[PDB]
Amino acid sequence: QFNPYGDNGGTILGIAGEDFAVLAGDTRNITDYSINSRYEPKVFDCGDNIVMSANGFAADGDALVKRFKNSVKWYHFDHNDKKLSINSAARNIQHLLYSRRFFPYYVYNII
Amino acid sequence: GSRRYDSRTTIFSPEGRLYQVEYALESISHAGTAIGIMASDGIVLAAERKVTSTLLEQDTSTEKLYKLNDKIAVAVAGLTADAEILINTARIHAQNYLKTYNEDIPVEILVRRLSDIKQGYTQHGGLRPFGVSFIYAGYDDRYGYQLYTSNPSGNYTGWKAISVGANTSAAQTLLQMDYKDDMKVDDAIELALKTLSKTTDSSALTYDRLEFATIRKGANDGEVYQKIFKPQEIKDILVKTGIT
Amino acid sequence: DRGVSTFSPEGRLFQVEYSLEAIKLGSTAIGIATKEGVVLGVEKRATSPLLESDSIEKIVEIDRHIGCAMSGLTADARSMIEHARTAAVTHNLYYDEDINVESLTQSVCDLALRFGELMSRPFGVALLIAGHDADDGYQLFHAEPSGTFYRYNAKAIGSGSEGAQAELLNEWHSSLTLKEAELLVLKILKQVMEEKLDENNAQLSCITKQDGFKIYDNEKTAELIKELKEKEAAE
Amino acid sequence: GYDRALSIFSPDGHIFQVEYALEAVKRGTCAVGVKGKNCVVLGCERRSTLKLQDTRITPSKVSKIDSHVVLSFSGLNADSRILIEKARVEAQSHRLTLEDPVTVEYLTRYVAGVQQRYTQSGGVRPFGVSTLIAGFDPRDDEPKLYQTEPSGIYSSWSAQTIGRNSKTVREFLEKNYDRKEPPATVEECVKLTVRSLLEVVQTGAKNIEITVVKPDSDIVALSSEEINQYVTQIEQEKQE
Amino acid sequence: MDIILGIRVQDSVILASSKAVTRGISVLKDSDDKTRQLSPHTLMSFAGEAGDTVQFAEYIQANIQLYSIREDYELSPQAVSSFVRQELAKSIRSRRPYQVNVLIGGYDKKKNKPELYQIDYLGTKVELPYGAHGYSGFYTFSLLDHHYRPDMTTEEGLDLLKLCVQELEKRMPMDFKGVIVKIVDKDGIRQVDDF
Amino acid sequence: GYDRHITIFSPEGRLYQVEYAFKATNQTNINSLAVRGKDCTVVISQKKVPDKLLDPTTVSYIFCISRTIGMVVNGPIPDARNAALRAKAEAAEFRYKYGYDMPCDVLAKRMANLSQIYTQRAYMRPLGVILTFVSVDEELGPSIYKTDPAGYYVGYKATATGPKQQEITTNLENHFKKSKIDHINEESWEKVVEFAITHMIDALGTEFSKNDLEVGVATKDKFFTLSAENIEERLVAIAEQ
Amino acid sequence: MTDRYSFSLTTFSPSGKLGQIDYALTAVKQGVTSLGIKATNGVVIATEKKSSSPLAMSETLSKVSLLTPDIGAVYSGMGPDYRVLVDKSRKVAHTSYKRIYGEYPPTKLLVSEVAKIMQEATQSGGVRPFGVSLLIAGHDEFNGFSLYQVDPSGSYFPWKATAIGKGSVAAKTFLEKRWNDELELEDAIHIALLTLKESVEGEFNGDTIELAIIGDENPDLLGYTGIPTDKGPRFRKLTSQEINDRLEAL
Amino acid sequence: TGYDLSNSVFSPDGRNFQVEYAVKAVENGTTSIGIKCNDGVVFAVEKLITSKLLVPQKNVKIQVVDRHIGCVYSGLIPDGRHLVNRGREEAASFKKLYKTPIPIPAFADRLGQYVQAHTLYNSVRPFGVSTIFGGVDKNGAHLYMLEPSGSYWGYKGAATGKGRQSAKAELEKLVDHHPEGLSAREAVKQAAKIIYLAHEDNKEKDFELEISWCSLSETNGLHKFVKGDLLQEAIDFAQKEIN
Amino acid sequence: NNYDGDTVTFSPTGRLFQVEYALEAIKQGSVTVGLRSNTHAVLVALKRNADELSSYQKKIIKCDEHMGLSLAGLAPDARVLSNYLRQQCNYSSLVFNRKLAVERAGHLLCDKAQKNTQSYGGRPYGVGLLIIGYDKSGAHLLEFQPSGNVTELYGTAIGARSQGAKTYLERTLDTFIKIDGNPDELIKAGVEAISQSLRDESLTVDNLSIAIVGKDTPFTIYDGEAVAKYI
Numbered sequence A: 001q002f003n004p005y006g007d008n009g010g011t012i013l014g015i016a017g018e019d020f021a022v023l024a025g026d027t028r029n030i031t032d033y034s035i036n037s038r039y040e041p042k043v044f045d046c047g048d049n050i051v052m053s054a055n056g057f058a059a060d061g062d063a064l065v066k067r068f069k070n071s072v073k074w075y076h077f078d079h080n081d082k083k084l085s086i087n088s089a090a091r092n093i094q095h096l097l098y099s100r101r102f103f104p105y106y107v108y109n110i111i
Numbered sequence B: 001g002s003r004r005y006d007s008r009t010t011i012f013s014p015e016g017r018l019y020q021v022e023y024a025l026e027s028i029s030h031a032g033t034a035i036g037i038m039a040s041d042g043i044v045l046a047a048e049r050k051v052t053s054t055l056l057e058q059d060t061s062t063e064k065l066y067k068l069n070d071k072i073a074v075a076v077a078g079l080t081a082d083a084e085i086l087i088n089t090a091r092i093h094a095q096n097y098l099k100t101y102n103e104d105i106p107v108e109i110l111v112r113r114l115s116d117i118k119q120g121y122t123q124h125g126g127l128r129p130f131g132v133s134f135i136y137a138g139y140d141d142r143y144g145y146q147l148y149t150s151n152p153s154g155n156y157t158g159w160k161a162i163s164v165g166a167n168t169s170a171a172q173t174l175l176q177m178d179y180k181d182d183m184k185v186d187d188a189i190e191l192a193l194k195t196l197s198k199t200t201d202s203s204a205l206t207y208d209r210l211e212f213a214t215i216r217k218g219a220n221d222g223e224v225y226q227k228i229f230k231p232q233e234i235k236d237i238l239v240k241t242g243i244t
Numbered sequence C: 001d002r003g004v005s006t007f008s009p010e011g012r013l014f015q016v017e018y019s020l021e022a023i024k025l026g027s028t029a030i031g032i033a034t035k036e037g038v039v040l041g042v043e044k045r046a047t048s049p050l051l052e053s054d055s056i057e058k059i060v061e062i063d064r065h066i067g068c069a070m071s072g073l074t075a076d077a078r079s080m081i082e083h084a085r086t087a088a089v090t091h092n093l094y095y096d097e098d099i100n101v102e103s104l105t106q107s108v109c110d111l112a113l114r115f116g117e118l119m120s121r122p123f124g125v126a127l128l129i130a131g132h133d134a135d136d137g138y139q140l141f142h143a144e145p146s147g148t149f150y151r152y153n154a155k156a157i158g159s160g161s162e163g164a165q166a167e168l169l170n171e172w173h174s175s176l177t178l179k180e181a182e183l184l185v186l187k188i189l190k191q192v193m194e195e196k197l198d199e200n201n202a203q204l205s206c207i208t209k210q211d212g213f214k215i216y217d218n219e220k221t222a223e224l225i226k227e228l229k230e231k232e233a234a235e
Numbered sequence D: 001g002y003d004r005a006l007s008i009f010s011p012d013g014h015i016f017q018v019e020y021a022l023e024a025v026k027r028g029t030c031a032v033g034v035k036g037k038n039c040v041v042l043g044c045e046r047r048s049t050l051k052l053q054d055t056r057i058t059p060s061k062v063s064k065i066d067s068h069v070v071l072s073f074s075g076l077n078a079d080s081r082i083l084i085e086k087a088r089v090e091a092q093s094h095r096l097t098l099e100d101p102v103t104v105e106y107l108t109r110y111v112a113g114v115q116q117r118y119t120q121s122g123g124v125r126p127f128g129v130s131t132l133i134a135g136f137d138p139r140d141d142e143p144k145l146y147q148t149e150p151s152g153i154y155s156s157w158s159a160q161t162i163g164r165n166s167k168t169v170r171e172f173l174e175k176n177y178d179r180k181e182p183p184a185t186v187e188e189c190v191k192l193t194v195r196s197l198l199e200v201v202q203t204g205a206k207n208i209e210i211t212v213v214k215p216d217s218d219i220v221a222l223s224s225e226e227i228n229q230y231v232t233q234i235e236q237e238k239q240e
Numbered sequence E: 001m002d003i004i005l006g007i008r009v010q011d012s013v014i015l016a017s018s019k020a021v022t023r024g025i026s027v028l029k030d031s032d033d034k035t036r037q038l039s040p041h042t043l044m045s046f047a048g049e050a051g052d053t054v055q056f057a058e059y060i061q062a063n064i065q066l067y068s069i070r071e072d073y074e075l076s077p078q079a080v081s082s083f084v085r086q087e088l089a090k091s092i093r094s095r096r097p098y099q100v101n102v103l104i105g106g107y108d109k110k111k112n113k114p115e116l117y118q119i120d121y122l123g124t125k126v127e128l129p130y131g132a133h134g135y136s137g138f139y140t141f142s143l144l145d146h147h148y149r150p151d152m153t154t155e156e157g158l159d160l161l162k163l164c165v166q167e168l169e170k171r172m173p174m175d176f177k178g179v180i181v182k183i184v185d186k187d188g189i190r191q192v193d194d195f
Numbered sequence F: 001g002y003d004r005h006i007t008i009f010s011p012e013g014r015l016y017q018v019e020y021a022f023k024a025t026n027q028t029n030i031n032s033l034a035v036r037g038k039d040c041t042v043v044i045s046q047k048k049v050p051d052k053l054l055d056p057t058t059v060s061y062i063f064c065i066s067r068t069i070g071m072v073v074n075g076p077i078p079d080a081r082n083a084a085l086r087a088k089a090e091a092a093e094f095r096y097k098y099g100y101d102m103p104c105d106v107l108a109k110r111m112a113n114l115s116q117i118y119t120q121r122a123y124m125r126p127l128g129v130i131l132t133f134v135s136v137d138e139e140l141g142p143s144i145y146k147t148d149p150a151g152y153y154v155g156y157k158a159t160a161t162g163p164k165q166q167e168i169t170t171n172l173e174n175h176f177k178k179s180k181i182d183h184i185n186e187e188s189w190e191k192v193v194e195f196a197i198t199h200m201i202d203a204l205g206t207e208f209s210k211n212d213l214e215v216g217v218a219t220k221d222k223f224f225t226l227s228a229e230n231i232e233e234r235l236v237a238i239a240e241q
Numbered sequence G: 001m002t003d004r005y006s007f008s009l010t011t012f013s014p015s016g017k018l019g020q021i022d023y024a025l026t027a028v029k030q031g032v033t034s035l036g037i038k039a040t041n042g043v044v045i046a047t048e049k050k051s052s053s054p055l056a057m058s059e060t061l062s063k064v065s066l067l068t069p070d071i072g073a074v075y076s077g078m079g080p081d082y083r084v085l086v087d088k089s090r091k092v093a094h095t096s097y098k099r100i101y102g103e104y105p106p107t108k109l110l111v112s113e114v115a116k117i118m119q120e121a122t123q124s125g126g127v128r129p130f131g132v133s134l135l136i137a138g139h140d141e142f143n144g145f146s147l148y149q150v151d152p153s154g155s156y157f158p159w160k161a162t163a164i165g166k167g168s169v170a171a172k173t174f175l176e177k178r179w180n181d182e183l184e185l186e187d188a189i190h191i192a193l194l195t196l197k198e199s200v201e202g203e204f205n206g207d208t209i210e211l212a213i214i215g216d217e218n219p220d221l222l223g224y225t226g227i228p229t230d231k232g233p234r235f236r237k238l239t240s241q242e243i244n245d246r247l248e249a250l
Numbered sequence H: 001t002g003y004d005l006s007n008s009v010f011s012p013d014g015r016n017f018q019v020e021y022a023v024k025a026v027e028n029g030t031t032s033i034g035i036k037c038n039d040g041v042v043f044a045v046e047k048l049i050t051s052k053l054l055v056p057q058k059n060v061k062i063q064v065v066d067r068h069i070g071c072v073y074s075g076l077i078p079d080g081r082h083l084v085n086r087g088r089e090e091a092a093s094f095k096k097l098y099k100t101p102i103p104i105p106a107f108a109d110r111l112g113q114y115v116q117a118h119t120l121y122n123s124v125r126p127f128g129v130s131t132i133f134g135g136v137d138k139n140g141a142h143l144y145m146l147e148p149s150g151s152y153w154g155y156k157g158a159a160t161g162k163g164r165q166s167a168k169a170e171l172e173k174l175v176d177h178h179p180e181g182l183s184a185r186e187a188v189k190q191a192a193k194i195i196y197l198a199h200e201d202n203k204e205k206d207f208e209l210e211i212s213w214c215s216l217s218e219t220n221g222l223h224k225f226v227k228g229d230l231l232q233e234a235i236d237f238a239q240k241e242i243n
Numbered sequence I: 001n002n003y004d005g006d007t008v009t010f011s012p013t014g015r016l017f018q019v020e021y022a023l024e025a026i027k028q029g030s031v032t033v034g035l036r037s038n039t040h041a042v043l044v045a046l047k048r049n050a051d052e053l054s055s056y057q058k059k060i061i062k063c064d065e066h067m068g069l070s071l072a073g074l075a076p077d078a079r080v081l082s083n084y085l086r087q088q089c090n091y092s093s094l095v096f097n098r099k100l101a102v103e104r105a106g107h108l109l110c111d112k113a114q115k116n117t118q119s120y121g122g123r124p125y126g127v128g129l130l131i132i133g134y135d136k137s138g139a140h141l142l143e144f145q146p147s148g149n150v151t152e153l154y155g156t157a158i159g160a161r162s163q164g165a166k167t168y169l170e171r172t173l174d175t176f177i178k179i180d181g182n183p184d185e186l187i188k189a190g191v192e193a194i195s196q197s198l199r200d201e202s203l204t205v206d207n208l209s210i211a212i213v214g215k216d217t218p219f220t221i222y223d224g225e226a227v228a229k230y231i
């Protein structure tokens, strides 16, 4: 039987400071006991001073980030180049994830 | 495109009338007269076949009086083909009701359903309306004996006595004159035939130019019987009432 | 006959141009934007004295920070208002924030040209959409059935529009207060209305950052009418 | 499907189909609505061109939408059945989803919305019907009376009339109805409703129908004899 | 839910329905009314899967109320029971059937007779002098078979009903938190507030 | 007068669009002829290549519908090819569904029914073509069936179509009045083609070169068209007697 | 593309006339004469094979058609319209009856289905009415022999005998004088040939006349033996020779 | 009258006036030609320089279908593009199912049936273009020309647009003087000349020459644009002949 | 006359009047100018107001980081077409990781507009567009007409009185094409070009709208005090 999911490993870490924030992640990509890549970027600058990382199943992670980056682009078009605040991005991402409630993006996401 | 050839069947005139409904009524006014008379102990349906021939097979023929179920019947005035479309729909509606509630359909509910179908053709779809006027004769345990009429507009009304088709103005005046509330079926039979005999465009009213039916509680004990009259039976009632 | 989406030889859509004629027959609605808020006022125009005038609802809330006044075939506005309210609240669901007045106006105007042979004809109603957001401050928009919307410092729509617009041309300046704007709407409404202006046949409303969108009471408006009469008699 | 745009603007900014639908309402029998201090009365004309009618089974002019709301109309009879059915379905749908019966204002807004939808939808013509919707909101003793028309606009009325010769009976109501002091009792409200119809009706026999609606789902239709007593008393006072 | 009982006596129909509602291992409510008035002289009690019961009952209620307004007339208990049966028989072959068993108690004003109908989720209808759903009948039918007469008064019906509930309370492993009892007769529907 | 624009009845009970589709049939100014032999069915048609820039090999109004069925068309080429594509599709579908080759008369009826629909349904126009189907049927033998824009079709002993159809028709009528048989009593198809060409020459009163004619022949289990050189051999034999 | 004619092409005129139906009846009037006569033990239907060309094989064009083993049909008016109606009539006899009840429909009900199809072409969107009048003869167990006429409107009437098309007015007068309730099938065929001769100009023989009967069961035309209840079709088309034999005793 | 107001209506002549009006739009367009040579085909088109602001060699008119078919047209340019888009879909589905690239006669009928379909209903307008197209397949070289009616034939030479008469006369001379045939490189030179000669009908504005070709020997049976030195050589040959 | 009731009808001379009437809507619209060099491409637009209380209607729309257009005619139709371009630019990026070629963008607009000119019920677009962009083959300028015709140009102008600006660019062709690596001078040439189409009114701070795209310059729009430099 076809299993649409996989586990590409990795680990991410986000810490909020008083006037700054960090989003860190390891660069290793794996399947089972093999290494796919020693350097495969996992944390992305999505625009508007927002950084994002979708950790878990890489294919779903790349799809989600790609869709959120797209959502930022269309937020500028639709709302007169207004800056997408971090709280507004968070809520937007909730709806991106729940659109697949019955066939989920198998990722743990931090922004 | 196609717009060029659209007659626009569902529009108001400047006076607020529906063109096609009015013209459909004009069509119906040339159809054979149909009369319904409601009495205390039953209902009469009488109707005139249009200029027949001697070679028409009358005993197997049916153009005016139709059976919707065991309790309800209709007299037709207008396009027979249009009427049969609606009659078959009404027969199905009555059976749907009986299957759902396990009770025979009340007369008005059946009438309202058919009238709603007629109405729809005047408001949407871009199709011509049904060129048909019905007289509904029926019985149920709520209101007892009932007469209704519906026309292409989809409007329906209840009656003690009523006519549709040709010469309704003259026919309605004659019915309004001789009708009384305490009237019985045998008297109503006579009134119906006398009215047709005076309003008819034909030279004389004969058995071969008539369809006749009664709905009577004259069935053995508390129940209702429909009687579609045979050619020989119409000939006998014409002699009995003293018309031929 | 002819297509509903047909262009005239001058390059205009027949139906859109004809819907504008219907809007000219509508009751007057005026909007004035200031730095203290935006004022919206309308002529109610009851067809009979037995008609309970308070049931005439020509000023309408879209969100807490956006209001709307209408003129023309007012029945057509109900689906536009429903869409606007849905768009405003839906954006709050998706983005956890108030929606920009311009973006709301654009969403309403996207419905405009969705007609053909979608709805069978354009809308026969014009809207004055007034509101406030953090980015562009107090704003007033005029939404037409053409799908076009202009921002305005002040605008009048309806039967007495060109007379009122000429008056708004002279009176408006960038330092107007909210109180001054209120009296100015009442003044111009009184000028173009057929019947004598009072609290029952005219209605005021405003949108401020603090209190949001508010329709004025008949008692509150009555005082502003009395205040207007006295200041006109003062010279 | 049939998508033809029947309701469209004309050069002068009029939708003729909607305006011709108002002419159908003008042709319809007269209907009147008067609200008192603690009630609303709906009066309706019955044209006496149709005798030999069975008044038991003939569709009544006033229709219950729910136990606390009624609807009368003027215009095409067949068209009114479609609005009434839709209204009745919406009333039960509201009770089912919100657990409260509809307010009179909500029901009116829905029926008005249906009428409006039929003025800018393809392949359909407007309803040739204006309605008077009356009743009392749940747990409220304030009377409610609304009017709708083919265009889809609606509004609340202290008293209103629609249909043929409505111009005349509105003239009567405008001078006779006082807002500061409305018909205090049921008698006064019915009397004023019958008086208004007597300006237009012809004979006061079976031509006048009256339906009284009181708070808390108390709706009754007056009989011929009860109405005839009002007709008798009015004319006897008039002979002076 | 669990226990719903019904008994048709001389001049009325009596319906008894349990008050308990359980989620997981906890009894959330002990005063739940498992019934809906379909019309002034027709009452329907219900029992089955969580959620489906109320949704189905309220859907039936809305349809009968709609009919009443349209025709200005109350449908007979027999007509209502047939409508309900068809909806369940329609439902059983659906993508996701409604798992609801009902009892319909009504007083026919035309015939001046009380009527009790038992309908299960498959659309199996039977008219009975007394009825039950689920396991309720296993405990109670022996008592009803013994004590029931068709000429019983409403008071005698209530006494026989108490005996049925007492037997249930003794031999069922299940605490159903007592019953709400309602009577359907010529004057309409009323609840027995002390039972 | 919109009863002349679409296919609805005029007051006279006529369909003018169908009648005007018949007139489009002669727009090409080409005459065709079909006759039956003992073992074969022959169809000949005039070929006119007015422009020198045209590739004459691509100019044709004869179509190979199936292995057994051939079709000649009288009318404009776009409608001709429309009909040809449909007939090919129908013939192939028939064989797939019913397990045997579509008969000539059955295809003719099918195409005639499609034409009838265009005369009744408003949104579809009639095709301005007359279709003559030919084959050697396995049950009926040599067969000629012709369809027109009215949706009419019938079998033929022989037939002719075009501007000068009447002249050809009478010529054929007179021959069959003499012989008193329903076909050309001849063994080889070559001589049946020679008969067809000869009688077209006599009827029209024009001589033909190899490039002036177009010939289609139906035999048992195949239909085929003749090349210019095959036609030349036919013209030589005619001239030598 | 898409069929954008979703509106009726037949509509009521101010006088109450349905123009397209009237015009369809005019097309029927121009059509070749066909007739039907009912006897005590059978029914006969007949028409002229108006050949468009002598080169045309008129045997391949069938104006008289079998609808069921016991029901036949003939027409006057537009031939192509008739051909497609026969296709639909044959199919509806199976789909709406035989596949349900396991037997062929009685004449009146098959007529009713044909009538319905013709009525729908009179009201549905983007179509014209059928330009034919049908005469449908048939037999069934409980109704016996019957003959029906069906018009472009969808209206149908049962006849003892009748004619439609070119010379129907004269032909119906001829039939009124000759018809009685004691006619045998051979007498009806004889009257049919007499009546049809008056409307025909040219050749009058078995090759120019098409004639069929609904009569006795034909076990020779069944195609198989072994089932007693299956006794064969009552519909039979008379041959060219069979017609000519009766033209000598004319 | 009124027969010319709606597409797919037969006039009493048996004519479709809407299609004939579409031809008028074709006759109004710029000149385009096609020449069949020994082992392939050559296409050429007149591009009117409306203004100096037009970027030279950028507004390409000739279009490729698949990799072996060339298409050029005169009339309403957007209608031509629509037709080529369909042609590309037809060619793709053919190759998808049957593997081999679509033969030219097969491709010709696909366009023909599609154009003919737009003469069957009043809900669509006929195509306002005549399209010259062709290429090399397994059976050799083929040249076609397709009209608004859906009518098409095979050609030795083809021409359409405002200067079609002048072009046709020139094409007829080549057919007569070269019965054995014309080479691909010759056909390119001749194509340039004919467009220059046909430009006398559009002599008000100056023009830009655009040529393409498919040849078994010169291009391996693939469609290619004539560029650089070979184009200039053809322009020089053309300019020499007019003087 | 009798052949202008819908877009599906040719006239006897082979003209499509509904398309020509749509073309007329562009001529009524306010003037906008487009011009490019080898490094940059510039749009200049004269915005139009309803009255003194009203704002000035926006003329320029961004489609991607490397592409955008200016409009003249029905503004809502420009919104529909620019939205389509945004989607197509975006489809190319998401699927092929490829910035959409300006020439291909023109071909897509042509095909979208064409479908509206051949079918019954619909209407042609009532707007003209000037598309600028910078892709792998350098700077580009396109002119879109709602007939479907799309043309690649060095410079052009559309709208009311656009002939004056178009003549100026036709004279200046050899000069402005050579303005490489100097965005300000290229804009100056555009502002000087659009000035040839002005009568009575002049270029004010809230009247003028400018956009630019180039080698190391994303598509950016300049309005308000950002264009006071060029007045």
Ligand SMILES: [Cl-]
Pocket (backbone or CB within 6 Å): F109, F110, F113, F114
């Ligand atoms: Cl078929």
